[PDB]
Amino acid sequence: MQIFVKTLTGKTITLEVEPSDTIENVKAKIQDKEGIPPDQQRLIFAGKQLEDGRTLSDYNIQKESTLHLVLRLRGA
Amino acid sequence: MQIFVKTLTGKTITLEVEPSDTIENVKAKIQDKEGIPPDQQRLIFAGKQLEDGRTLSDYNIQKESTLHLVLRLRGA
Amino acid sequence: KSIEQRYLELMKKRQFDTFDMIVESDNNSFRFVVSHHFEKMVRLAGDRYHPSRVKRLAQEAVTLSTSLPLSFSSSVFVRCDTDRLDIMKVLITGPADTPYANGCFEFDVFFPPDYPNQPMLINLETTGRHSVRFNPNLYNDGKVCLSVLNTWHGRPEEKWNAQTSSFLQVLVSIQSLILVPEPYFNEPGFERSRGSPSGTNSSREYNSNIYQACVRWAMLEQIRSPSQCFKDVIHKHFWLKREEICAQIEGWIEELGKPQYTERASRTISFNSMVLRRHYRHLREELSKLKPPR
Amino acid sequence: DIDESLYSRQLYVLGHDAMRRMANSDILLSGLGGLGLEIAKNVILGGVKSITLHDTATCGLHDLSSQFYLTEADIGKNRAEASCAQLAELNNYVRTVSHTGPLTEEFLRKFRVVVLTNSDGEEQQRIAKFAHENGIALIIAETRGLFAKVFCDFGESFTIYDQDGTQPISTMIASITHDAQGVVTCLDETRHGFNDGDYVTFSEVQGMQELNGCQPLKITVLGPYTFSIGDTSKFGEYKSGGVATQVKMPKTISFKPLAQATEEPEFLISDFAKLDSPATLHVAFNALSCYRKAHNGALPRPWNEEDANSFLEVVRASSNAEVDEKLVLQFAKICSGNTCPLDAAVGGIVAQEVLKACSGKFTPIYQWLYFDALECLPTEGVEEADAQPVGSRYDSQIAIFGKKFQEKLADSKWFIVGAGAIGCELLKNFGMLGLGTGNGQIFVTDMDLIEKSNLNRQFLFRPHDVQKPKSMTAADAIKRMNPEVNVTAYELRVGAETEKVFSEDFFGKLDGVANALDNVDARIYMDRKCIFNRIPLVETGTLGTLGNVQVIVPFATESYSSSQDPPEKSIPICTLKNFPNAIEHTLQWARDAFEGVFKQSAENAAQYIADPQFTERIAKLPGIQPLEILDSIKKALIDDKPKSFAHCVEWARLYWEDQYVNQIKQLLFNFPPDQITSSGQPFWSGPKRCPDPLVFDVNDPMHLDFIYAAANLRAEVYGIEQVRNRETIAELVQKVKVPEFKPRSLDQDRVDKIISELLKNADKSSKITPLEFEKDDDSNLHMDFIVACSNLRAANYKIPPADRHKSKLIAGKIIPAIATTTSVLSGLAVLEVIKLIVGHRDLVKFKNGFANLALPFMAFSEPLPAAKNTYYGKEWTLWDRFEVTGELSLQEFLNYFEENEKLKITMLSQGVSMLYSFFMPKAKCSERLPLPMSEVVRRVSKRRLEPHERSLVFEICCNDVDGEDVEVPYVRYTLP
Numbered sequence A, B: 001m002q003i004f005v006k007t008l009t010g011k012t013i014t015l016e017v018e019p020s021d022t023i024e025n026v027k028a029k030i031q032d033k034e035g036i037p038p039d040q041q042r043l044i045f046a047g048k049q050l051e052d053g054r055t056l057s058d059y060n061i062q063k064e065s066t067l068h069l070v071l072r073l074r075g076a
Numbered sequence C: 001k002s003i004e005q006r007y008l009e010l011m012k013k014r015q016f017d018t019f020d021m022i023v024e025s026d027n028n029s030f031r032f033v034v035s036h037h038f039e040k041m042v043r044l045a046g047d048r049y050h051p052s053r054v055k056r057l058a059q060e061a062v063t064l065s066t067s068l069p070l071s072f073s074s075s076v077f078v079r080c081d082t083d084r085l086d087i088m089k090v091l092i093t094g095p096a097d098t099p100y101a102n103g104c105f106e107f108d109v110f111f112p113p114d115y116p117n118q119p120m121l122i123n124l125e126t127t128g129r130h131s132v133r134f135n136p137n138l139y140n141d142g143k144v145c146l147s148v149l150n151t152w153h154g155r156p157e158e159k160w161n162a163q164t165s166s167f168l169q170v171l172v173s174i175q176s177l178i179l180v181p182e183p184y185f186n187e188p189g190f191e192r193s194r195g196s197p198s199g200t201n202s203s204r205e206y207n208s209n210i211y212q213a214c215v216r217w218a219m220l221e222q223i224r225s226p227s228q229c230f231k232d233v234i235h236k237h238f239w240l241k242r243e244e245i246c247a248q249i250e251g252w253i254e255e256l257g258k259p260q261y262t263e264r265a266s267r268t269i270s271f272n273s274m275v276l277r278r279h280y281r282h283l284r285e286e287l288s289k290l291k292p293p294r
Numbered sequence D: 001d002i003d004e005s006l007y008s009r010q011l012y013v014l015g016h017d018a019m020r021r022m023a024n025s026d027i028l029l030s031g032l033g034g035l036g037l038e039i040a041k042n043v044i045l046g047g048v049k050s051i052t053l054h055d056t057a058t059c060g061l062h063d064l065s066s067q068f069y070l071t072e073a074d075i076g077k078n079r080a081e082a083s084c085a086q087l088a089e090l091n092n093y094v095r096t097v098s099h100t101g102p103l104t105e106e107f108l109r110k111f112r113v114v115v116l117t118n119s120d121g122e123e124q125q126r127i128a129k130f131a132h133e134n135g136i137a138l139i140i141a142e143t144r145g146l147f148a149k150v151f152c153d154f155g156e157s158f159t160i161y162d163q164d165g166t167q168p169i170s171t172m173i174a175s176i177t178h179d180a181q182g183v184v185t186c187l188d189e190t191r192h193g194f195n196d197g198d199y200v201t202f203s204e205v206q207g208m209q210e211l212n213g214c215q216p217l218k219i220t221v222l223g224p225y226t227f228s229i230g231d232t233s234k235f236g237e238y239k240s241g242g243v244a245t246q247v248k249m250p251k252t253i254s255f256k257p258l259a260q261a262t263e264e265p266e267f268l269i270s271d272f273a274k275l276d277s278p279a280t281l282h283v284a285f286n287a288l289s290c291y292r293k294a295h296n297g298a299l300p301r302p303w304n305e306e307d308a309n310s311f312l313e314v315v316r317a318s319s320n321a322e323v324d325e326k327l328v329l330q331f332a333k334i335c336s337g338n339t340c341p342l343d344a345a346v347g348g349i350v351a352q353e354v355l356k357a358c359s360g361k362f363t364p365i366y367q368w369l370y371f372d373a374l375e376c377l378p379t380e381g382v383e384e385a386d387a388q389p390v391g392s393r394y395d396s397q398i399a400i401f402g403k404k405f406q407e408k409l410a411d412s413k414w415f416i417v418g419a420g421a422i423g424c425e426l427l428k429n430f431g432m433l434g435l436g437t438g439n440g441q442i443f444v445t446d447m448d449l450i451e452k453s454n455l456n457r458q459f460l461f462r463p464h465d466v467q468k469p470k471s472m473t474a475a476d477a478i479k480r481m482n483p484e485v486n487v488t489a490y491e492l493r494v495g496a497e498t499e500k501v502f503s504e505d506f507f508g509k510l511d512g513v514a515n516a517l518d519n520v521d522a523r524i525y526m527d528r529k530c531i532f533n534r535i536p537l538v539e540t541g542t543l544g545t546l547g548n549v550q551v552i553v554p555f556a557t558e559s560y561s562s563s564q565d566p567p568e569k570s571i572p573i574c575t576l577k578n579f580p581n582a583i584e585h586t587l588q589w590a591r592d593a594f595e596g597v598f599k600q601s602a603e604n605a606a607q608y609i610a611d612p613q614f615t616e617r618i619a620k621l622p623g624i625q626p627l628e629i630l631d632s633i634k635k636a637l638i639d640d641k642p643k644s645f646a647h648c649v650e651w652a653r654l655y656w657e658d659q660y661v662n663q664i665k666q667l668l669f670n671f672p673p674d675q676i677t678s679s680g681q682p683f684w685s686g687p688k689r690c691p692d693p694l695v696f697d698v699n700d701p702m703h704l705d706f707i708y709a710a711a712n713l714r715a716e717v718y719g720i721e722q723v724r725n726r727e728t729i730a731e732l733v734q735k736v737k738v739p740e741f742k743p744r745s746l747d748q749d750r751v752d753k754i755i756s757e758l759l760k761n762a763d764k765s766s767k768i769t770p771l772e773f774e775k776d777d778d779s780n781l782h783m784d785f786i787v788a789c790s791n792l793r794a795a796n797y798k799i800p801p802a803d804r805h806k807s808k809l810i811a812g813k814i815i816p817a818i819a820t821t822t823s824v825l826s827g828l829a830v831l832e833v834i835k836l837i838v839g840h841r842d843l844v845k846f847k848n849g850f851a852n853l854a855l856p857f858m859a860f861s862e863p864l865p866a867a868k869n870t871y872y873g874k875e876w877t878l879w880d881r882f883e884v885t886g887e888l889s890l891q892e893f894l895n896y897f898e899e900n901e902k903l904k905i906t907m908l909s910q911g912v913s914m915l916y917s918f919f920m921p922k923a924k925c926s927e928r929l930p931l932p933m934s935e936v937v938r939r940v941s942k943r944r945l946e947p948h949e950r951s952l953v954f955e956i957c958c959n960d961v962d963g964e965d966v967e968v969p970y971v972r973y974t975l976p
């Protein structure tokens, strides 16, 4: 299936993913275009932070869903 | 090729570049070594201000050439 | 249609709108008809603005008109002044499976004249008159903590960047990294104490406090006295999810009723449970009075 | 000690040691021309022990071109004697005398530094030899038309204590390897900023305690975050902690004598596009003396070909090295003239070299400096007949630029924004240039008043001029210097609120704008005005020994707003609140506490007392604002109101306890001191310092100082008479009972209730008055309270305390400034102004200037051309705009653009307002469409349109015919 990801600047990118693809695979795919290394990325869907090892089917992410790319924060 | 960058406050920086790099690459290296974003950097060489999109060959910057990293001031 | 489908179809049209926050006054002055935290700073700024700010704000408005997150778990709503893009109010609903779930949190956003060089200013209004600290990053005075919001030395990939940072990024950062399922471990140093029984008890105590705090302020006060900008959004959100909210609060109650290992945490948990029952009774009273939106 | 109330800004540049050394140095200045006068003025403002003005020449008409202390009535008198009386008024701490006798060997022994101007070759050689043989610093300065020459000889062994003027940088240590090449790693990947080969010292190191307080060690920077300090195996293992601080190592250099240095010169490059200029200028300046000896002591005639050829032949005969013959001819053609801005710049440089010689601070020129401003001349040159003298005070200037340029100057109109140091220097230079003396005018504006600290670097003001407006006083001062100058002065602050006076008509007859401001908002506003009115703008800024000039030319260069400066560094919320680690954090926290306690807590109470109808006004406020105001009023007027000074002392004691004991105990309760994370590092490690609550001791000077300052300020807030007796306050504070503290883990009805309590219990006879923070007054106790608060919070976290000097520098946001930098940058800016007035348009002629007088360093660059963008194949820059005339409706405006420019407007804005947008409500869109644009602007901006407004500026975001966004120039809408 196809999914979108909105980057830091609001620029939307287009990706192709398996239902069983790990979020690590998705992170690598985003790096293949825009390059922030995966352990620095944070992927957002339905308000939950996705964890590296699960598949999109674990989160029930489905075709034409939009994801948000944010970064690991650091404390005040 | 190795070039030197002198800050207006008198600190000297050594960069490892090639006669074909681009000013954006030079500014990114300066960012790595110093921490100023590339858009806040003003490089002066031989009475010319280096602008993005050009290479060192156009400005004739050769080995052991010295650049100047200047800044504007808000007093008066 | 399923209730989630109805919620998604109904809240989509109202994600980004404009509201009359400022009206004309005597002797060529203006007054705020809504409570904005940064009114003093707006007046101090006056008419000063950087030339790039207008273009940056136009691009940000274009982005926000389509790009705001929207889901049955959490959503973000943005209101701006009808005549000034630099004055905004943000409503964020708590994500599910978190202590903030189905709670409406309101923020005030003001874009300084130096934007986008300086980061925008954001302040939390849903603090219960400064008597509640909802998160380690959300101080009770309203100040919001984010690394993205600071130009101090930090790290280049962590600072506020004039090009690679945006309002949407900040909103998603708040909505997904501050409203975490376990807010207790947000504080640095406490992050590595997780997995131990003491850390689990401390997190349970923090969540028990946040449960009643959110039930009181994020739901009951928002239903009783909603903000003028988010009145109908709040009404629709609370009417469409009243059963889920009641079930979630009941589950919170049952979880708080479980036995505890330590008396120090047990006393606080029992007190928070009694307070949460007291607030949940009032919330049930208020929910039944909600007239169904047209 | 040094009088800080006068030298406040200069101390932050020089230092106490340097100023003490200059206070024991005697200066002899030979030659009192324009350059000598500038040197004397800057040195006197510097504050040397004494200065002796020696001169043998008599005042003439040619001297009036740059000497602002000489009048036509002074013709025939000795220049030094005439100018000594006026020069003495600049600084009463400096003893100024005049000498007219010969410069004998015994007379020279009394001076630490000797400056020689207009001296002949033989006298120069003799005095240089004597000074070098007897250990006297010697500086030789000359100015010939648009050329300059500076020589420095500070002795056989000169010691510099601070080579660069920069503050030491301290970094915090994460790990140190224990081997023969021990590597220090910074904390959480933060750049140390240490230069290669630097010397550092260590403190607060646990385990490697031998490195604590050790002698400086040479380091090797292995990367942006790591460096090596040599063999560390002889010390113990590193546990944690440690701070490495840079140490400034003194340097000793040797200066060659003049007699030697002439044949092997070392040149300081002033312009890197003219690397071959100093070599030719050295020979030209050397051969000028020979030409004078060969022509009865007469310089070559202005713009004379025969004299230029003779000088070229003399240069050829005197030296065997190849020289730029064209440069030699150009030098010979204008060597007989003299101009003001060049003299000011060279005087500023030479005065910095005098201060360097006196104090031993900063690196001197090593050894020759040659400067020129040949770009100010017209491209085609000046005809000889045009450069002939006309018996006027500008004869030396006509010898350079000609009479036609003088006529152009007389008719020029220029606007100077800000009358500070840069503003005063620009005013003096413009007056001496003859600008606006004919049909032109010089406009100067400033909203501030004269303060005592301003007299150190602003030479146009006097101690009796305090509390007077800056602009009017400067205008009168420069009117006295040159009676022909026409000046109009305003007491207004430039901005949107003063457009009634600075309207479009006012900017329409201007020829340029010179900026002398100290903030970015005014600079941006003046740029927007200059862009809209299409007039050149010259921007100047200084910071200590640093300075820059930027020149903006319409349709030629980018604007000051096209590029961006580093943002003002703010402090993380958690670093100010809970975990400070530097004195800056504590100082900012103390400033915030002062504001919140003495100003914000009383504004609402004062407003309620002053305004009888305040309650009914605040009863209509939306949200919880009425409650948030009423409860603050009640707290300020009833709960915390002190009825006596004893109550003020009790409140101060309780505030001290709460700030330095209770909150720290709470913080330690939240985070135990011995808390350690799972991986091993303790929570109270690295950037977080473990605090410890203080114990109150009346015998401790810090605690008593804080109690005194806080109690006196609190009494001042409520109008209670202050008790400025330390013993009385100490006696009173010992009787205060401190309650025990333990750590912890209907709205309309309330409004009416608080209103009732206010009208019943609260008294309107009170005198609540919020305090405005003033740092320049030593009797208001503001700075004392700030210092006490910051130092107490520092002792809370074991942060090294800072004295009153550093606290005033940091908390007060004081910008260091010195007179030399101001003079240099003003001279450079006036040179750019002259270039603009000449009529130059090609960017090679113009030069942005950058300088740092500490290194010394000076550099120039061509201004960047305006960026070019295309829409529908049409090129446009930031200077281009659309022209819409008449009165049109909003719909007519959109249709005009859609039909003529083929652009669909999706967002129309006016300043910060938003007239039209794609996401606006449909009702408001329908309402605003038929209205005229002026009415729409009035409705949206919520303010009336003043009659002086003849046009409006609109910014539009457009979409082309294909539906993609395109950048387009702004729109100038002409009102009917």
Ligand SMILES: *P(=O)(O)OC[C@H]1O[C@@H](n2cnc3c(N)ncnc32)[C@H](O)[C@@H]1O
Residues within 6 Å of the ligand: B075, B076, D417, D418, D419, D420, D421, D422, D445, D446, D447, D448, D470, D492, D493, D494, D495, D516, D517, D518, D519, D522
């Ligand atoms: P330094 O601070 O010595 O000199 C700056 C002077 O400029 C004046 N000034 C600052 N900002 C403005 C505006 N907006 N309008 C007019 N004058 C201004 C300061 O008062 C200093 O005199």
